[PDB]
Design an enzyme around this catalytic site. Structure first.
Site, PDB file in Angstrom:
ATOM      1  N   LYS A  70       4.994  -8.554  -1.486  1.00  0.00           N
ATOM      2  CA  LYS A  70       6.189  -8.340  -0.678  1.00  0.00           C
ATOM      3  C   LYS A  70       6.721  -9.633  -0.074  1.00  0.00           C
ATOM      4  O   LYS A  70       7.895  -9.685   0.309  1.00  0.00           O
ATOM      5  CB  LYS A  70       5.886  -7.324   0.424  1.00  0.00           C
ATOM      6  CG  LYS A  70       7.095  -6.869   1.224  1.00  0.00           C
ATOM      7  CD  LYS A  70       6.671  -6.060   2.438  1.00  0.00           C
ATOM      8  CE  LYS A  70       7.869  -5.530   3.204  1.00  0.00           C
ATOM      9  NZ  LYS A  70       7.465  -4.708   4.378  1.00  0.00           N
ATOM     10  N   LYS A 129     -11.223  17.067   9.320  1.00  0.00           N
ATOM     11  CA  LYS A 129     -12.350  17.885   8.883  1.00  0.00           C
ATOM     12  C   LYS A 129     -12.051  19.379   8.958  1.00  0.00           C
ATOM     13  O   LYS A 129     -12.972  20.194   8.833  1.00  0.00           O
ATOM     14  CB  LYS A 129     -13.599  17.545   9.704  1.00  0.00           C
ATOM     15  CG  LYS A 129     -13.574  17.998  11.156  1.00  0.00           C
ATOM     16  CD  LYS A 129     -14.832  17.540  11.891  1.00  0.00           C
ATOM     17  CE  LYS A 129     -16.107  18.149  11.322  1.00  0.00           C
ATOM     18  NZ  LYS A 129     -17.263  17.994  12.253  1.00  0.00           N
ATOM     19  N   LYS A 177       0.820  -1.206   0.000  1.00  0.00           N
ATOM     20  CA  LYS A 177       0.000   0.000   0.000  1.00  0.00           C
ATOM     21  C   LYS A 177       0.857   1.260   0.000  1.00  0.00           C
ATOM     22  O   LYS A 177       0.545   2.230  -0.704  1.00  0.00           O
ATOM     23  CB  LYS A 177      -0.930  -0.007   1.211  1.00  0.00           C
ATOM     24  CG  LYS A 177      -1.847  -1.216   1.273  1.00  0.00           C
ATOM     25  CD  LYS A 177      -2.438  -1.405   2.658  1.00  0.00           C
ATOM     26  CE  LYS A 177      -1.458  -2.083   3.601  1.00  0.00           C
ATOM     27  NZ  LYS A 177      -1.357  -3.543   3.343  1.00  0.00           N
ATOM     28  N   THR A 178       1.940   1.261   0.778  1.00  0.00           N
ATOM     29  CA  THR A 178       2.778   2.450   0.875  1.00  0.00           C
ATOM     30  C   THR A 178       3.386   2.807  -0.474  1.00  0.00           C
ATOM     31  O   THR A 178       3.452   3.986  -0.842  1.00  0.00           O
ATOM     32  CB  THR A 178       3.877   2.231   1.913  1.00  0.00           C
ATOM     33  OG1 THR A 178       3.298   1.751   3.133  1.00  0.00           O
ATOM     34  CG2 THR A 178       4.622   3.525   2.186  1.00  0.00           C
ATOM     35  N   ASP A 222       0.844   7.107   6.630  1.00  0.00           N
ATOM     36  CA  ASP A 222       0.989   5.678   6.412  1.00  0.00           C
ATOM     37  C   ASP A 222       1.064   4.941   7.740  1.00  0.00           C
ATOM     38  O   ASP A 222       1.636   5.443   8.712  1.00  0.00           O
ATOM     39  CB  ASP A 222       2.233   5.377   5.577  1.00  0.00           C
ATOM     40  CG  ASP A 222       3.511   5.757   6.285  1.00  0.00           C
ATOM     41  OD1 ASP A 222       3.578   6.882   6.820  1.00  0.00           O
ATOM     42  OD2 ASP A 222       4.448   4.934   6.306  1.00  0.00           O
ATOM     43  N   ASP A 223       0.483   3.741   7.770  1.00  0.00           N
ATOM     44  CA  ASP A 223       0.490   2.888   8.954  1.00  0.00           C
ATOM     45  C   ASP A 223      -0.164   3.603  10.138  1.00  0.00           C
ATOM     46  O   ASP A 223       0.468   3.912  11.149  1.00  0.00           O
ATOM     47  CB  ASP A 223       1.919   2.440   9.287  1.00  0.00           C
ATOM     48  CG  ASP A 223       2.134   0.949   9.075  1.00  0.00           C
ATOM     49  OD1 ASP A 223       1.159   0.228   8.782  1.00  0.00           O
ATOM     50  OD2 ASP A 223       3.292   0.496   9.203  1.00  0.00           O
TER      51      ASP A 223
HETATM   52  N1  LIG Z   1     -29.931  24.716   4.165  1.00  0.00           N
HETATM   53  C1  LIG Z   1     -28.717  24.483   4.676  1.00  0.00           C
HETATM   54  N2  LIG Z   1     -28.616  24.228   5.997  1.00  0.00           N
HETATM   55  C2  LIG Z   1     -27.407  23.994   6.514  1.00  0.00           C
HETATM   56  N3  LIG Z   1     -26.224  23.970   5.899  1.00  0.00           N
HETATM   57  C3  LIG Z   1     -26.353  24.225   4.593  1.00  0.00           C
HETATM   58  C4  LIG Z   1     -27.533  24.487   3.916  1.00  0.00           C
HETATM   59  N4  LIG Z   1     -27.288  24.706   2.569  1.00  0.00           N
HETATM   60  C5  LIG Z   1     -25.988  24.575   2.466  1.00  0.00           C
HETATM   61  N5  LIG Z   1     -25.358  24.287   3.649  1.00  0.00           N
HETATM   62  C6  LIG Z   1     -23.925  24.085   3.837  1.00  0.00           C
HETATM   63  O1  LIG Z   1     -23.743  22.743   4.193  1.00  0.00           O
HETATM   64  C7  LIG Z   1     -22.427  22.633   4.773  1.00  0.00           C
HETATM   65  C8  LIG Z   1     -22.514  21.583   5.853  1.00  0.00           C
HETATM   66  O2  LIG Z   1     -22.751  22.181   7.143  1.00  0.00           O
HETATM   67  P1  LIG Z   1     -21.875  21.794   8.398  1.00  0.00           P
HETATM   68  O3  LIG Z   1     -20.471  21.534   8.025  1.00  0.00           O
HETATM   69  O4  LIG Z   1     -22.058  22.870   9.463  1.00  0.00           O
HETATM   70  O5  LIG Z   1     -22.575  20.482   8.946  1.00  0.00           O
HETATM   71  P2  LIG Z   1     -22.604  19.670  10.314  1.00  0.00           P
HETATM   72  O6  LIG Z   1     -23.935  18.925  10.374  1.00  0.00           O
HETATM   73  O7  LIG Z   1     -22.293  20.536  11.465  1.00  0.00           O
HETATM   74  O8  LIG Z   1     -21.472  18.590  10.076  1.00  0.00           O
HETATM   75  P3  LIG Z   1     -20.734  17.411  10.851  1.00  0.00           P
HETATM   76  O9  LIG Z   1     -21.717  16.244  10.799  1.00  0.00           O
HETATM   77  O10 LIG Z   1     -19.519  17.082   9.984  1.00  0.00           O
HETATM   78  O11 LIG Z   1     -20.385  17.836  12.235  1.00  0.00           O
HETATM   79  C9  LIG Z   1     -22.118  24.024   5.342  1.00  0.00           C
HETATM   80  O12 LIG Z   1     -21.123  24.565   4.484  1.00  0.00           O
HETATM   81  C10 LIG Z   1     -23.386  24.835   5.043  1.00  0.00           C
HETATM   82  O13 LIG Z   1     -22.938  26.069   4.502  1.00  0.00           O
HETATM   83  N1  LIG Z   2       3.021  -3.730  -8.102  1.00  0.00           N
HETATM   84  C1  LIG Z   2       3.605  -3.463  -6.930  1.00  0.00           C
HETATM   85  N2  LIG Z   2       2.882  -2.835  -5.979  1.00  0.00           N
HETATM   86  C2  LIG Z   2       3.460  -2.563  -4.807  1.00  0.00           C
HETATM   87  N3  LIG Z   2       4.704  -2.830  -4.406  1.00  0.00           N
HETATM   88  C3  LIG Z   2       5.397  -3.449  -5.366  1.00  0.00           C
HETATM   89  C4  LIG Z   2       4.939  -3.796  -6.625  1.00  0.00           C
HETATM   90  N4  LIG Z   2       5.935  -4.427  -7.354  1.00  0.00           N
HETATM   91  C5  LIG Z   2       6.954  -4.447  -6.530  1.00  0.00           C
HETATM   92  N5  LIG Z   2       6.702  -3.873  -5.312  1.00  0.00           N
HETATM   93  C6  LIG Z   2       7.630  -3.747  -4.196  1.00  0.00           C
HETATM   94  O1  LIG Z   2       7.049  -4.426  -3.104  1.00  0.00           O
HETATM   95  C7  LIG Z   2       7.328  -3.727  -1.870  1.00  0.00           C
HETATM   96  C8  LIG Z   2       6.006  -3.242  -1.338  1.00  0.00           C
HETATM   97  O2  LIG Z   2       6.020  -3.349   0.100  1.00  0.00           O
HETATM   98  P1  LIG Z   2       5.366  -2.238   1.012  1.00  0.00           P
HETATM   99  O3  LIG Z   2       6.286  -1.989   2.203  1.00  0.00           O
HETATM  100  O4  LIG Z   2       5.021  -1.037   0.226  1.00  0.00           O
HETATM  101  O5  LIG Z   2       4.066  -2.953   1.568  1.00  0.00           O
HETATM  102  P2  LIG Z   2       2.986  -2.672   2.703  1.00  0.00           P
HETATM  103  O6  LIG Z   2       1.796  -3.589   2.436  1.00  0.00           O
HETATM  104  O7  LIG Z   2       2.681  -1.236   2.822  1.00  0.00           O
HETATM  105  O8  LIG Z   2       3.719  -3.220   3.992  1.00  0.00           O
HETATM  106  P3  LIG Z   2       3.389  -3.998   5.342  1.00  0.00           P
HETATM  107  O9  LIG Z   2       2.302  -4.991   5.120  1.00  0.00           O
HETATM  108  O10 LIG Z   2       4.719  -4.623   5.761  1.00  0.00           O
HETATM  109  O11 LIG Z   2       3.021  -2.900   6.335  1.00  0.00           O
HETATM  110  C9  LIG Z   2       8.208  -2.553  -2.287  1.00  0.00           C
HETATM  111  O12 LIG Z   2       9.525  -3.075  -2.387  1.00  0.00           O
HETATM  112  C10 LIG Z   2       7.752  -2.307  -3.721  1.00  0.00           C
HETATM  113  O13 LIG Z   2       8.886  -1.807  -4.413  1.00  0.00           O
END
Ligand SMILES: Nc1ncnc2c1ncn2[C@@H]1O[C@H](COP(=O)(O)OP(=O)(O)OP(=O)(O)O)[C@@H](O)[C@H]1O
Ligand SMILES: Nc1ncnc2c1ncn2[C@@H]1O[C@H](COP(=O)(O)OP(=O)(O)OP(=O)(O)O)[C@@H](O)[C@H]1O
Ligand SMILES: Nc1ncnc2c1ncn2[C@@H]1O[C@H](COP(=O)(O)OP(=O)(O)OP(=O)(O)O)[C@@H](O)[C@H]1O
Ligand SMILES: Nc1ncnc2c1ncn2[C@@H]1O[C@H](COP(=O)(O)OP(=O)(O)OP(=O)(O)O)[C@@H](O)[C@H]1O
Ligand SMILES: Nc1ncnc2c1ncn2[C@@H]1O[C@H](COP(=O)(O)OP(=O)(O)OP(=O)(O)O)[C@@H](O)[C@H]1O
Lengths: 535, 16, 415, 125
Positions: free
Chosen positions: A503, A426, A344-345, A398-399
């Site tokens: 790997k 957020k 993944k990394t 990562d991780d």
């Molecule tokens: N009628 C509406 N009422 C409320 N928000 C609205 C409306 N129309 C657009 N928006 C926009 O929707 C966005 C979402 O609002 P907000 O981020 O405050 O939500 P929240 O419910 O507090 O979120 P969270 O669940 O992540 O805590 C805001 O940018 C607000 O401007």
């Molecule tokens: N198609 C491929 N995709 C990803 N890695 C590849 C690929 N081909 C070769 N590799 C090699 O395989 C290794 C990938 O291992 P990597 O550390 O990124 O895995 P990881 O799943 O994130 O690790 P872990 O499970 O140990 O936390 C690297 O050496 C990368 O160069």
């Protein structure tokens, strides 16, 4: 008489990448003194007598100060090199400070309005001027110095023929009373250049060589400008200087007695190879991520052993484009999930590298071994603060399960880090700026339990090798076993299902290779059988 | 307890 | 007048094992002062004005600095010994700094571009050039000194006839603004030598003895170079000195009045027995290994009471070969497990001993009694950091469950 | 003045009656607190499912009033803070609010302000 030397040209001062800042400074500072007087008298304003410059090291503040000093037609400027005023006696520092303004006061008193201009330059101004009442020891002199300076700049008596320039690296440590309008108004920040600024700077420092035909015809400036990312002016000059020396060194013999040819020295030329070599072993930027990081994170490259490899990249490109274009959603997030030893990394690093954004950073736990909880929180906050300053940014985490210390027994973990991450996932950056966040993990259910999987916008799955055909394709792409041995291998795997991570295959092959030539395929098959499967 | 750090000093001149 | 002394010769310096570093330093620092002046003028470049050298103790930094000082035809270098410029009166520590640049400025003003070269040496630079606090309320104890030095090296007034050399053991504490390409551009690391460097150093320190027929004919220096693994430059000199002292001691008698037999002192010669005795009792390296620990962990040896004893050792040999002859996997680990009192810590020690790697270290809980978890983590980090400065390393972790403080009740452990 | 643009980043659109109902209730509460003497202190809680827009509606309700003093306390500023720094910050905000004749204060994301996690569970007392 004008205040600008008649033989002055903006291209003579050799500064590139700061057109806007210079324009603003000229507008704010020297506009009044060049305009015809009578209108100014009718308008009844007072001139400005203060400029402050701040920024990171090596961006060109002192160059601006020196060039401004040279531009104006006036008396020779007075320059103070750091804390050069302090004295061991009592009341001598204040006398030294007062001795700077004597001539200006005398001329103001004598000639009144029709008087020349006096320039004073303070280098490292933060050494002498700091907020009053913060030093536990020896503060008796510092506060008096600050008060004397404040009174002299703006006191009961008024002066109208002085200009003060200051340079600093820590703008937030200076006393506030010194930064109010009327004392130091024009505050300027000098930052790293963009591609065009880098191109201009590179052109400035190579004019003489081109003029004298010492530069080879295969050198392309635009390629260098594109390549040299995150560099500053000093670093570009250093790169050019190292390139110049690598060429000079080919005509010297320092074996026993230092001798020069002097018959091949003529026809000295600088080639592209010198620039390339100097860029890999001599100069290295002190900002952002560079090749030495991608080399460690992506060690064995990427090989297309199947379809999903392209699918993941094509899914990441859509999100990169969405963050680039859309304006209703400045902040985006994504989670890459899969079984252990899936790679993944590497995929995350590849996507970030191909993003081509100006700012890229990777936050990994292996740089914070042994840290406490507050240290971890503070080190994460610093990386997230530097992306807000840029325009469009990308960040990788990562991780996650290792970032917060999770262990199945208990369970046990760091609550502080979890809360900090939930807050930061957020938080939106300032208006007009965009940020992309990528995160990798290997335990989805645990994150789901903590209610973190609903702070992400989408998820991408990274599967394992599942069929013998893919295994054979990977073996062929690696080129480790010959056709004869691959036939025997295929005779066994084609009638079975496999479950292995990429790997782990590279380790199994290395383990197998140690045996004798006769017992290689046998050992490899035995290890593969031992691995088993559990889809 | 960490012992207090070092300190600077100020001087006064006298005329005969 | 040439910058280099007329009679200078590389072999005269007496430095061995640092041929690449010196070449790089010469190229980056003195290349533009040897070439004809007119062509350099046409290019319009400025000279470099800084060098920094860092590394572990005893590898030859102060020797290189002194030789560089002696190889130039210029004034006498100025030397600062650690914090020699601190004073108690306000405003004197900075006058001391400003007093080091007077001659250079005066000569620059007078003679223009025909001036000589002025050198300055800062020994233990990290004592007076630490990072500035840069946050209100923890201002550094000495920041005015740092600001003065920064303003003087590169300020509004330009100098082109100076050179500064610094030396340190902790390169990560220096202020960043002091290391940018305009102030201290050339940074070099001095590390442990390899076999060829060891041979070169031994020849340098034995040449004079070989001149006067004071060295016996049964001494082979190549064998000594092979034996002395992971020795710093100072340790080889100490070994030679100890051998000479042992050789001399045979012609003196000190249990009563001290007398020297000056009739057999004219047939004095140094034999290999002295070298062998010195290698066993006197000199003990720091990044090498010694046989005492193995005797401590393999107390009663190893007896072949069955077949498994051979299988366990053969598997370790195979793993060692794989780790040494592989490129795709630069890191490999293995775990030895079994019931208690089965003798698993001696087998690991034996495998590590038979590996024949230059660097072998053992991490044991015997040296961490009463430590808190933070100290234990710091110790482990120290060992692993020391292990990354060698081309081939082997590490052993013993009694993992006593390292984690595991107890079945609860259970309880250190996370 | 608070940066209401940050909290209200896309305005408000009347897609249904509940928006008007909530705004009317907020106006009624503001009037009651403005024109009362037996009850100098009033409190109200807004609750709903996630991603409903509670913060934007609360910010709008606060803005529509014309009280001299208005402030919003959010966990966005308290990153990495201990369980004492948060208390000190809240105390300072309320002390400042006490000075004015009329005050309005908004506390958002309560569960994030208590460091709640459903495993065990955990929180700061
Ligand atoms: N009628 C509406 N009422 C409320 N928000 C609205 C409306 N129309 C657009 N928006 C926009 O929707 C966005 C979402 O609002 P907000 O981020 O405050 O939500 P929240 O419910 O507090 O979120 P969270 O669940 O992540 O805590 C805001 O940018 C607000 O401007
Ligand atoms: N198609 C491929 N995709 C990803 N890695 C590849 C690929 N081909 C070769 N590799 C090699 O395989 C290794 C990938 O291992 P990597 O550390 O990124 O895995 P990881 O799943 O994130 O690790 P872990 O499970 O140990 O936390 C690297 O050496 C990368 O160069
Ligand atoms: N924008 C630029 N254009 C051209 N040359 C530049 C520029 N910035 C830096 N340089 C080159 O880098 C040299 C060093 O820059 P300078 O001394 O002005 O930096 P500074 O910001 O004052 O540094 P510091 O923060 O270390 O005191 C300049 O003399 C010039 O050679
Ligand atoms: N590369 C070398 N070649 C020859 N002799 C050497 C070398 N390195 C060290 N020595 C010998 O060791 C002596 C002491 O080493 P030196 O003072 O140069 O070390 P150093 O790295 O500056 O030490 P420290 O870090 O402890 O301050 C030298 O004078 C010389 O006799
Ligand atoms: N063939 C052998 N293999 C291993 N050890 C042997 C052998 N023959 C003799 N010994 C001796 O047996 C002892 C093994 O003890 P050791 O401490 O290594 O065991 P251990 O199982 O790791 O102990 P514990 O369970 O107490 O931690 C050593 O003194 C070793 O020299």
């Amino acid at each position: 008489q004008s205040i600008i030397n008649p033989d002055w040209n903006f291209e003579k001062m050799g500064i590139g990448g700061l057109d806007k800042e210079f324009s603003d400074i000229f507008r704010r500072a020297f506009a009044s003194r060049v305009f015809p007087p009578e209108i100014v008298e009718q308008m009844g304003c007072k001139h400005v007598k203060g400029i402050l410059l701040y920024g990171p090291p090596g961006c060109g503040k002192t160059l601006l100060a020196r060039q401004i000093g040279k531009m104006l037609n006036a008396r020779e400027p007075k320059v103070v090199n750091g804390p050069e005023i302090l004295n061991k006696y009592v009341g001598e520092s204040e006398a030294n400070i007062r001795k700077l303004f004597a001539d200006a006061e005398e001329e103001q008193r004598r000639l009144g309005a029709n008087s020349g201009l006096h320039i004073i330059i303070f280098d490292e101004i933060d050494a002498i001027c700091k907020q009053r009442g913060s030093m536990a020891g020896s503060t008796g002199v510092h506060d008096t110095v600050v008060n004397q300076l404040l009174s002299k700049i703006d006191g009961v008596e008024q002066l109208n023929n002085i200009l003060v320039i200051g340079m600093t690296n820590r703008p937030d440590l200076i006393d506030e009373a010194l930064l109010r309008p009327g004392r130091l108004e024009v505050k300027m920040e000098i930052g790293l250049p963009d591609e065009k600024g880098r191109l201009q700077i590179l052109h400035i420092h190579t004019a003489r060589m081109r003029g004298h035909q010492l530069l080879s015809a295969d050198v392309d400036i635009k390629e260098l400008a594109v390549e040299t990312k995150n560099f500053s002016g000093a670093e570009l000059e250093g790169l050019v200087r190292a390139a110049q020396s690598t060429a000079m060194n080919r005509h010297i013999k320092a074996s026993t007695k230092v001798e020069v040819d002097m018959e091949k020295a003529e026809s000295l030329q600088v080639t592209r190879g010198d620039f390339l070599a100097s860029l890999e072993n001599d100069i290295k930027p002190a900002f952002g991520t560079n090749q030495e990081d991608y080399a460690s994170y992506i060690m064995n490259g990427i090989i297309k052993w199947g379809d999903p490899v392209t699918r993941v990249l094509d899914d990441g490109e859509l999100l990169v484009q969405q963050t680039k274009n859309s304006d209703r959603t400045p902040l985006v997030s994504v989670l890459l999930e899969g079984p252990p030893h899936s790679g993944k990394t590497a995929l995350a690093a590849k996507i970030a590298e191909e993003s081509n954004f100006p700012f890229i950073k990777i936050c990994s736990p292996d740089k914070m071994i042994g840290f406490s909880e507050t240290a971890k929180c503070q080190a994460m906050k610093k990386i997230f603060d530097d992306a807000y300053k840029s325009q469009l940014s990308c960040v990788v985490v990562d991780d996650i399960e290792r970032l917060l210390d999770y262990v199945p027994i208990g369970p046990r973990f760091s609550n502080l880090v979890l809360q900090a991450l939930l807050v930061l996932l957020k938080k939106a950056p300032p208006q007009g700026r965009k940020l992309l966040i990528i995160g990798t993990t290997s335990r989805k259910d645990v994150l789901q339990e903590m209610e973190m999987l609903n702070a992400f916008s989408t998820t991408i799955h990274v599967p394992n090798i599942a069929t013998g055909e893919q295994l054979l394709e990977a073996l062929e792409l690696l080129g480790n076993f010959k056709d004869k041995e691959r036939t025997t291998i295929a005779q066994q795997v084609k009638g079975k299902k496999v479950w292995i991570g990429i790997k782990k295959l590279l380790m199994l092959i290395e383990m197998s290779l140690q045996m004798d030539p006769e017992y290689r395929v046998r050992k490899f098959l035995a290890l593969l059988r031992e691995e088993g499967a559990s889809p | 307890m960490a012992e207090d750090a070092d300190m600077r000093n100020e001087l006064e001149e006298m005329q005969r």
